[PDB]
């Protein structure tokens, strides 16, 4: 009755997934968060 | 009932080239008894507007065979040959 042109619009268009190869350097925390993890260690080690 | 023959008639009205504006499909359904008496079991009463096909015939197109009377031979035989005709 309603036709084969309409019932194709009854099924939904599904999304196939792809891969999402990123590189992902390790996630840098924020600096105010980085000093709750490590307390008063600032300016003590020589970085060289 | 074991088997049913649907002897049916249709009345179409159009709205475009292959859409229908209205369909009226009536008909009689038939049962063959073992004593060869044919008694009607019921009726068809279909009526719709703005359709794209007839449901009654499309149901019978797949779920049953047509009562075929024009039985065609495997190889057709010519009656007369030459120039006679």
From Swiss-Prot, chain A:
Q: What's the stated role of this polypeptide?
A: Fatty acid synthetase catalyzes the formation of long-chain fatty acids from acetyl-CoA, malonyl-CoA and NADPH. The alpha subunit contains domains for: acyl carrier protein, 3-oxoacyl-[acyl-carrier-protein] reductase, and 3-oxoacyl-[acyl-carrier-protein] synthase.
Family designation: Belongs to the thiolase-like superfamily. Fungal fatty acid synthetase subunit alpha family.
Assembly with partners or alone:
[Alpha(6)beta(6)] hexamers of two multifunctional subunits (alpha and beta).
Q: What is this protein called in UniProt?
A: Fatty acid synthase subunit alpha
What is the name of the gene encoding this protein? FAS2
UniProtKB/Swiss-Prot annotation, chain B:
Q: Which cysteines are joined by disulfide bonds?
A: none
Q: How does it assemble?
A: [Alpha(6)beta(6)] hexamers of two multifunctional subunits (alpha and beta).
Function text: Fatty acid synthetase catalyzes the formation of long-chain fatty acids from acetyl-CoA, malonyl-CoA and NADPH. The beta subunit contains domains for: [acyl-carrier-protein] acetyltransferase and malonyltransferase, S-acyl fatty acid synthase thioesterase, enoyl-[acyl-carrier-protein] reductase, and 3-hydroxypalmitoyl-[acyl-carrier-protein] dehydratase.
- What family does the Swiss-Prot or TrEMBL record give for this protein? Belongs to the fungal fatty acid synthetase subunit beta family.
Which protein are we looking at?
Answer: Fatty acid synthase subunit beta
Q: What is the lineage of its organism?
A: Eukaryota, Fungi, Dikarya, Ascomycota, Saccharomycotina
Shown residues within the full chain? 1444 to 1528 of 2037
């Amino acid at each position: 009755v309603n036709g084969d042109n309409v019932d194709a619009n009854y099924s939904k268009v599904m999304v196939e997934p792809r891969a999402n190869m990123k590189f992902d350097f390790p996630t840098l925390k924020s600096y105010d968060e980085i000093k709750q993890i490590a307390p008063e260690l600032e300016g003590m080690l020589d970085l060289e | 009932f074991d088997v049913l023959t649907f002897r049916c008639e249709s009345t179409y009205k159009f709205k475009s080239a292959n859409v229908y504006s209205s369909i009226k499909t009536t008909g009689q359904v038939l049962l063959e008894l073992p004593t060869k008496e044919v008694i009607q079991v019921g009726s068809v009463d279909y009526e719709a507007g703005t359709s794209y096909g007839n449901p009654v015939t499309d149901y019978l197109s797949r779920n049953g065979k047509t009562i075929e009377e024009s039985v065609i031979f495997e190889n057709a035989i010519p009656l007369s040959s030459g120039e006679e005709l």
